[PDB]
Structure formats: C-alpha cells, structure tokens
Design a protein around this ligand. Structure first.
Ligand SMILES: N[C@@H](CCC(=O)N[C@@H](CS)C(=O)NCC(=O)O)C(=O)O
Ligand SMILES: N[C@@H](CCC(=O)N[C@@H](CS)C(=O)NCC(=O)O)C(=O)O
Ligand SMILES: CC/C=C\C[C@H]1C(=O)CC[C@@H]1CC(=O)O
Ligand SMILES: CC(C)C[C@H](N)C(=O)O
Lengths: 569, 214, 214
C-alpha cells in the first residue's frame, strides 16, 4: 500500500544498507538459483563464507553471443531452464547487437516486483516534489498492445507488454499513478497508431484533473506533439459529431470509442480558438492541461536532443528526468526529480540485482578488475556489469556511465552515453543497407500519402514450412492495405542479392510476411532501451530478428494492423 | 535554364519531369491553369495547347515521349535511356507506344467513367498490366539494363494506381504484383521521388472529376 | 533477307516499304490475310496482331513508324532519314505524331464514313493539310535536306489522296497544290514509285470497304 513517508524512509534505510542488500541480493539470486548449469561449469554450490569472493574469482565475464544459444535453448520447443533457471514467462531483446544478431534474456515475476517498487518509490519522491491530486488523471502515451508467442509455445516479451499485460499490473499500479485516460483495450488495441491518436485524444479527454504528461522519452513526447500539430483539426471533427474519423478500422477500439461518443459542437469553437492562438506551438503542453506540474520522461543521453523540441512544447513547464533500468536489471531511481535534465542523475536501488563496474581508468580501455558499487569512484566513469534475475550474471552490457555523487551511501549515476557500439558481422541480413534500402523502396508507395516511414524491423520464422521472413514497419498514418501489400513485394524486390532469389523463387524459404505494426513500437523499443540499466549506450536497434531476439518480438504479433503474405510468387 | 510547362497531375508532365531529373538537369517548373493557358504555352503549342512543354534555347519542345527522347539527345554523355543496339531501341519505343494506347485509355476508363464503360476498361487494364508483367519478366527496368526510356513512360502511372484501386474497387496487385512491385522499386530514383505529387490528392482529383460528371 | 508482314492497301505498311527501298535494303514482301494470319504474324505479335512487322536477325519489329526508326537506326550509313540535331528529330517526331493521329483520324472520317462525320471530317482534313502546308512553310521535303522521316510518314497518304478527292469531294490541290505536288515530287522516287500501289486500286478498295460495313 503506497504512502509517501514510510517508503522513502525504508528507501533511505535501504540505500544506506547498500552493501548488505546488494550482498543479500547476490545471496537471494543464488539461493533461488544454486542450480544454474552455467554455474556448474563455474563451480558453485552456494553458502560457504567466501561467496562473493568465490563468485568474482570463479565466474567469467560474458557477452551476448555466449548467452545467445542458452536462452535460445529455453525459447524454441525445448521449453527448458538454463542460465537463470525456470523457463521464464517471457524473454527480452537487447539494443546494439549480438554480432549483428539477436540477444535473448529471461523475464521473471521478480522483474515485475522491481518494477512496481521503483515506480512505487519513484512516484513517491516525485510527488514529494510534484504533488498530484488523488482524484485526477494522467496523459500517458504508454502502450503494450502486442503479445507474440515464441515457436516453442513459450511467451517471449518486452518490458512494457509483460508489465502491462501482467496480472499484477492493474491492481499494483492502481494506487501509485493517476488513473489512465485510456481504457486498457485501446492501450492494448491491435492498432496503436490509431490507438495513439485515441491516446492523444484520451489524455486530452480529462485535461483539467490531468497532473502530468508522460512518455518514457522526450522523443516519444515530441512524436506525439508533432503529430498533434498534424491532426488537431481532425481530432476536432472526430470528437465533435460524436463520430470518430474513418481513419479508425479495428472494431474493438471503435466499439469502445463509440461508447465514448455523442454529438457536441460548441467546444470546437474553443479548441480552434486556442490552437490557432499559439506561436509555433511553443508551450503546447501547459496549454492542454495547464495544471500539470510536470513533463515526465527520460531526459539524458541520446535523448538530450529531444529535450529541446519538447521544451518548446513544454514551454516553461518543468521537465523531470525519469529513472533508469529495464528487464535486464533495474539500476537507479531519481529521488530528486526536481533536478533539470542536464544535471539529472539517478541513484541505484540495491536489491534489484548485484551490480559491478569496469573502470576505463588507464587509457581506453584499461586492464583493471571490477570493484564494488560503493567502491566505485566519484567523477570517474565506469561500465556496468549486471547480475540479476534477468539472466544476467556478471554480464557485460557494454555501456559507460559517470559518478556525480552519493545520496547518503548509495552513489549517483550520470549518462552521457548513446551507442553501445562496436558491431560484428550478422545473418539477419541481407545487409544493413539491403534491409534499409528495402524499406526505402517499399515505403514510397506510402510516401504518396504524404507520409514518411519512421522506423522498421524484421524476423526469421522457422516454425513454418517453408519458413518466412517478417518485415515490420512504423509509419505516420493509417492507410489502405493495397499499398502496404505493394510494399511487402518491394521489400522482397529490394533484396537485390542473387541468393534470396534462389529460395523464394524456388520457394524453400517461404513468402515474406509484411506485418504492418502501429506507431510507437520502435518507440517502445527505444524507450525501454535507453532507460535500460547500464548506461545510455543503448540505442542501435537490431534490424532483423533471428529466433533469438525478443523485446521487439512480443511486440511483433498482436498489432498486425494488417499482415500479409505476398500474393505474388 | 530549361522552362517546363507542367500540370500537377499530368502523368505526362511527370514523364517530362522524371526524364529530365533522371538525367541531370536543374530546371524550373511552372504550374498551369488550363483555363488560362500561358502566353508562352499558347506560343509553344497554339492549337494542342497541351503539356508537358520543355523550353530550351527558346525552342518549345512538346509531347511527353517526344520530350523524354529530347532529354536523351540534349545531354548525350551520362545517363542514356536506350541500350546501344537499334533493335533494343525499337523494342523500347514499341513498348512506349504500348504504354500510350490501350493502357492509357483503359485507366482513363477505370477512374473517369462507370458502369458498362467501367468493366470494359477494367478487364482492359488487367489485360494490359498482364502483358506488361509478362514482358517485365525479370528485368529491374525496361529499356536497358538500368533505368530506361519507358521506365519513365510507365512509372508515372503508379501514383494513379491508388485511384484505380478505389473507384475500380479492385486490387491490381493479386492479378499482377511484380508490376506495382517494380513501381515502388522505380520510386527510389530521385527523378520520380521528387517529380510526382501525392496520390491521395491524385485520388481526390479523379474524385473531383467523377463528382463533376455523374 | 528481312521479312515484312504487310497489307497492300495499308498506308503504314507502305511507310515501311518506302523506308527499306529508300535505303537500298533487299527484303522479301509478305501479304497478310487478317482472315488467315500467318504463323509468324501470330508468333511475332501475340497482342495487336497488326501490320507492318519486319523480322531481322531473328528479332521482330512492329508498328510502321517503329519500323522506319528501326530502319534508320539499323542502317545509318548512306541516306540518313533524320537531321543530326536533337531538336530537328524532335520536330520530325512531333509532325510524325500529327499525321498519324489527327490527319489519320480525319482521313479515317473521309474515306471510311458517311454524313456528319464525313463533313466534319472534310473540314478536319483541309484544316490539317492547311497546317502541313504551313509547317512546311514551303519546304520540298520534311525530314532532312533529302527525303526524310515525316515525308515517309505522310507520303503513303498520297496514294489515298485520290480516294479523298473522290469521297470527300474536295480538291486538296486547288486548296493546297503544294502538298499533292510535294507528293508528286516524291513520286519520282522508286521508294514511292514502287512502294505505293496504284491509287486506282486503293480507290476501288476503300469504296469496297464502304460496301461491306454499314
Ligand atoms: N500523350 C499526351 C497526353 C497529354 C494529355 O492529354 N494531357 C492533357 C491532360 S489530361 C492535357 O494537357 N489537356 C489539355 C487540357 O486539359 O485543356 C502527353 O503525354 O503529353
Ligand atoms: N500502330 C499500328 C496500328 C495500325 C493498324 O491498325 N493497321 C491496320 C493495317 S491497315 C491493321 O493492322 N489492322 C488490324 C486489324 O484490321 O485488325 C501501325 O500504325 O502500324
Ligand atoms: C521500474 C519502472 C517500470 C516502469 C518503467 C517505465 C515507465 O513507465 C517509464 C520508463 C520506465 C522504464 C525505465 O525506467 O527504464
Ligand atoms: C517497463 C515499461 C513500462 C517501460 C519500459 N521502459 C519499456 O518500454 O519496455
């Protein structure tokens, strides 16, 4: 049960207990999982009285390539347990690549627990700094409308979908958020670009009680608002006649929205008046719900360029930087949210995992060995290595972060990070160029509609005979299928290489499937990633999914706003 | 500086713009109000009064396919649309003539007329896109091993494909896919990717045309 | 030897014959029965099944004007049909398009029709011959300093001049002596003195056509 003072006190006690709870986090992870086969090869059994020392002297650091076959083993019909343990209820993907290729990680109910608490805690310190009305609401551009099922019959998933469609999500978040404007089915609408418009419209619906505007990211926010600049007159029309735009085709959201609609002409006079009154839409956000106390989102790292466009939108409204973690392990809360984005820092919550740091202090890089978290050095930058319930045990995520200070005894983290970048050579390609060129070729049938392609992805399905390619697309508007069908053909026609030519012309690799997905999917991916625990080197999204990639994958299937197999061929 | 007399939905004006931009000319476009055909246009073709019209050396160059061969011959050093043999040239010209007859009239029928006229036009264009699909066979383009003469000739019809799909209430793609398929392939050329206006608008122009004449 | 599929009263087929003969190319003449089209006509043109069609190097070329350009491009060594410049080949193409359509449509209403279509047709033909006389400015030929492209395009309508003189009841010569006599110059050439059948035969033929279809 969420309250302000007790949780912050316990959080104070806890951050001050940083060593014990960290050490205990280690013990707990391993108590739960003394059985890991990874660990068998390492010599573990638990207990003893040199545990921490034994773990750190006996267990080698690991990369995405090496963790790939094992969680892959878990996901594909070998429903089996491995690097963590339990076949997990879901699996993630990780930005940057595993040699150009897919990265799999386990999701457990622990990951849901950390989730509520960090936000339990987060909202508490922020509402400590930005107190909300206990009867108002929030404009949250959040989505987890999609849920794919892996080929072994096992769920593999995003942080969003798995949290939002989690059984404990609704009851758990009931007390620590202002109630969502959107009915869950539209949030979970098989069409989230249309649902996004419905979301624009939903948060817009209860503005006067609305206490914050939220996206995980500033870029998410700005995406919403440039779109706002595009569609406000249409929204006026839709909401006005009590009849929704012909833009909207999926019946359950249409069903829910008709439940929301009756004809109301006066207010249009209002919105039109205010909206045309602005100077280049500056300060749009306080214009919509003028008593929102904040704009909330991740403001650091590769999102720093999106803080300003958003600031333009935010006007003089304060920007509060969001905390930092993902399914791969939670890292740190901002408990002083009143701090500006440029100075925003996030302090580590210690039972979320057992975390260690490799110093770059020598040159670049530096053959120094990992030292503890309160053993880390102020002002210096270290790489995060993660041990938690997410499949990570002493795992190199590949990201560099800086110590600005300590809140009591737990250290304060800063990100000036962006790409976790080096790469290696692939096989979800059909080169980066070939795939990218491909979307380019196909997307211009859409360009004819005054729309540009925002983002794209892909996938190898080998449950099917023959197996098939799935191309995923993020565009700026609803359209017809015919052009999208057309597009899929071009995705196929853009793969200029002779090889692909052999199979699909013969047909021993099946017709590519274009499953068009809805707005914000790749936004779901960026938002989950930069927030992901390590250091904002977290944004080069892998472009085609081998069976071993997941975070994009849960998000794969359910918002097929349409999905097709080439009627050519 | 080449002056082009053009019309936003002219598939033919588009033949001109695509041709020129395919080559390497920087040129100016002037939009026509065919209710008020220009002093320079009425001097370019005082009887047809039709576009596209490219003006070079103060010499009016008229008719779309005429204008694109003009494109070839006015800058003969970089991007040829024909191949080297005379027979290949006659094949490409052959097929450009193909683009211009039963193909153009049939689309004219599918978005311009209805009923007894419509289905005639509908089976005509499916037939056309089928002989088309047959001769495309495999080639990335049409008139050479690269972006060709008639590539320019028939690519420009692929923004009206939306128009045809809707009033026809068809889908010209499950009957002959490699065609539209080749089209969004040809859209990657900066020659057509900046010369051709939006198809919802093109759709809407045929909608205006239809609403006028029912 | 190149193989021409043709039709003896066809003006367009005469255009082809004219081109090869103006050159010096030795070719074999073939008459097609549209009632009983030969295997090669069917195997060269699966779609239009129309004449003329020349088989050369085992590759088929169809349409008369295509042919002529095919003939110029394959034999560019002795008597060139087009000017060297882009802009003159331009005008020639422009004017080759003019006689093939409006002049051929108008003429089509003259010999093949009755009543109002024939009267309006008469007006169209004399206006069009008036324009041809005007563009000609007053040139001896059309397409180059010697016998040219659009001369070749138009000259085969001179074998039908007589049929237009009879059915349209007009003298294209008292109104434009320059075009008929443009033809009567060009008639001194074996390309026209051996390609265009007697105008008597075309007159009896077209009159026969008007007997067959009502
Ligand atoms: N084959 C011609 C067709 C051109 C044509 O018919 N253009 C029409 C546009 S539909 C035009 O300019 N009409 C003049 C007018 O509408 O007054 C070309 O490619 O230029
Ligand atoms: N573009 C062709 C079309 C000509 C055309 O229709 N020619 C007549 C010969 S006089 C023809 O072949 N008609 C075929 C038929 O009667 O079905 C050309 O100019 O040669
Ligand atoms: C523990 C937080 C779980 C919910 C987190 C998600 C949000 O609702 C904002 C982003 C955040 C992800 C992040 O902090 O990395
Ligand atoms: C945990 C979620 C609510 C948000 C998370 N950053 C994601 O996009 O997956």
């Amino acid at each position: 049960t969420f309250d302000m003072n007790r949780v912050i006190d316990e959080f104070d006690e806890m951050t001050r207990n940083a060593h014990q709870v960290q050490k205990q986090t280690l013990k707990e992870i391993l108590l739960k999982n003394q059985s890991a086969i990874y660990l068998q090869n390492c010599g573990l059994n638990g207990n003893a009285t040199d545990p921490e020392e034994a773990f750190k002297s006996m267990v080698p650091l690991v990369t995405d390539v090496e963790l790939e076959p094992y969680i892959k083993r878990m996901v594909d019909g070998d429903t089996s347990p491995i690097l963590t343990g339990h076949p997990v209820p879901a699996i993630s993907l990780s930005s940057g690549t595993s040699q150009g290729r897919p990265k799999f990680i386990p999701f457990t109910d622990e990951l849901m627990e950390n989730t509520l608490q960090l936000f339990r805690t987060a909202f508490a310190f922020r509402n400590r700094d930005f107190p909300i009305d206990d009867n108002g609401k929030a404009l949250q551009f959040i989505f987890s409308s999609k849920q794919y099922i892996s080929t072994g019959g096992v769920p593999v998933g995003t942080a969003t979908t798995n949290v939002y469609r989690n059984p404990n999500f609704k009851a758990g978040m009931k007390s620590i958020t202002s109630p969502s404007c959107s009915p869950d089915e539209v949030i979970f609408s098989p069409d989230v670009h249309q649902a996004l418009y419905c979301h624009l419209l939903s948060g817009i619906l209860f503005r006067d009680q609305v206490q914050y505007v939220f996206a995980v990211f500033a870029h998410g926010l700005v995406h919403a608002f440039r779109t706002f600049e595009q569609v406000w007159e249409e929204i006026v029309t839709d909401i006005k006649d009590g009849v929704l735009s012909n833009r909207i085709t999926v019946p359950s959201v249409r069903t829910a929205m008709s439940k929301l609609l009756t004809p109301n002409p006066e207010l249009a006079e209002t919105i039109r008046t205010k909206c045309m009154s602005l100077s280049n839409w500056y300060g749009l956000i306080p214009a919509l719900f003028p008593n929102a106390k904040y704009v909330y989102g991740i403001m650091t790292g590769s999102m720093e360029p999106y803080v300003p466009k958003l600031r333009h939108y935010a006007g003089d409204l304060p920007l509060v930087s969001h905390d930092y973690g993902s399914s791969e392990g939670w890292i740190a809360a901002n408990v002083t949210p009143r701090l500006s984005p440029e100075e925003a820092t996030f302090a580590v919550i210690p039972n979320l995992g057992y975390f260690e740091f490799l110093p770059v202090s020598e040159t670049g890089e530096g053959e120094e060995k990992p030292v503890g978290l309160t053993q880390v050095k102020i002002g210096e930058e270290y790489e995060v290595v993660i041990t938690n319930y997410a499949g990570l045990y002493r795992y190199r995520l590949g990201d560099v972060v800086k110590v600005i200070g300590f809140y009591n005894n737990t250290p304060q983290l800063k990100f000036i990070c962006r790409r976790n970048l080096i790469l290696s050579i692939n096989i979800d390609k059909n080169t980066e160029r070939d795939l990218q060129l491909s979307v380019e070729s196909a997307a211009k049938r859409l360009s004819e509609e005054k729309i540009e392609v925002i983002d794209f992805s892909s996938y190898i399905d080998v449950s099917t005979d023959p197996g098939h390619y799935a191309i995923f697309w993020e565009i700026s508007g609803e359209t017809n299928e015919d052009v999208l069908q057309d597009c899929c053909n071009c995705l196929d026609r853009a793969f200029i290489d002779a090889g692909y030519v052999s199979s699909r012309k013969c047909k021993t690799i099946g017709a590519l499937e274009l499953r068009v997905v809805a707005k914000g999917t790749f936004r779901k991916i960026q938002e989950h990633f930069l927030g992901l625990g390590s250091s904002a080197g977290q944004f080069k999204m892998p472009r085609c999914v081998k069976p071993s990639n997941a975070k994009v994958l849960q998000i794969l299937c359910e918002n097929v706003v349409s999905s097709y197999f080439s009627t050519a061929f | 500086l080449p002056i082009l007399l053009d019309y936003w939905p002219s598939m033919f004006g588009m033949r001109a713009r695509v041709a020129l931009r395919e080559k390497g000319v920087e040129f100016e476009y002037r939009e026509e109000d065919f209710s008020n055909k220009s002093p320079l246009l009425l001097q370019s073709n005082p009887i047809h009064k039709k576009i596209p019209v490219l003006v070079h050396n103060g010499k009016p160059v008229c008719e779309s396919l005429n204008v694109v061969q003009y494109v070839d011959e006015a800058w003969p050093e970089k991007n040829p649309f024909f191949p080297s043999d005379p027979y290949g040239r006659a094949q490409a010209r052959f097929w450009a003539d193909f683009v211009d007859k039963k193909f153009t009239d049939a689309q004219f029928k599918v978005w311009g007329k209805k009923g007894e006229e419509q289905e005639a036009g509908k089976k005509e264009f499916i037939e056309a896109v089928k002989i088309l699909e047959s001769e495309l066979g495999d080639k990335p383009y049409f008139g050479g091993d690269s972006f060709g003469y008639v590539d320019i000739s028939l690519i420009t019809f692929s923004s009206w494909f939306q128009a045809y799909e809707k009033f026809g209430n068809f889908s010209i793609e499950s009957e002959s896919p490699k065609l539209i398929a080749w089209a969004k392939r040809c859209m990657e050329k900066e020659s057509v990717s900046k010369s051709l206006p939006d198809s919802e608008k093109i759709v809407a122009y045929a909608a205006e045309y239809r609403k006028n004449n029912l």
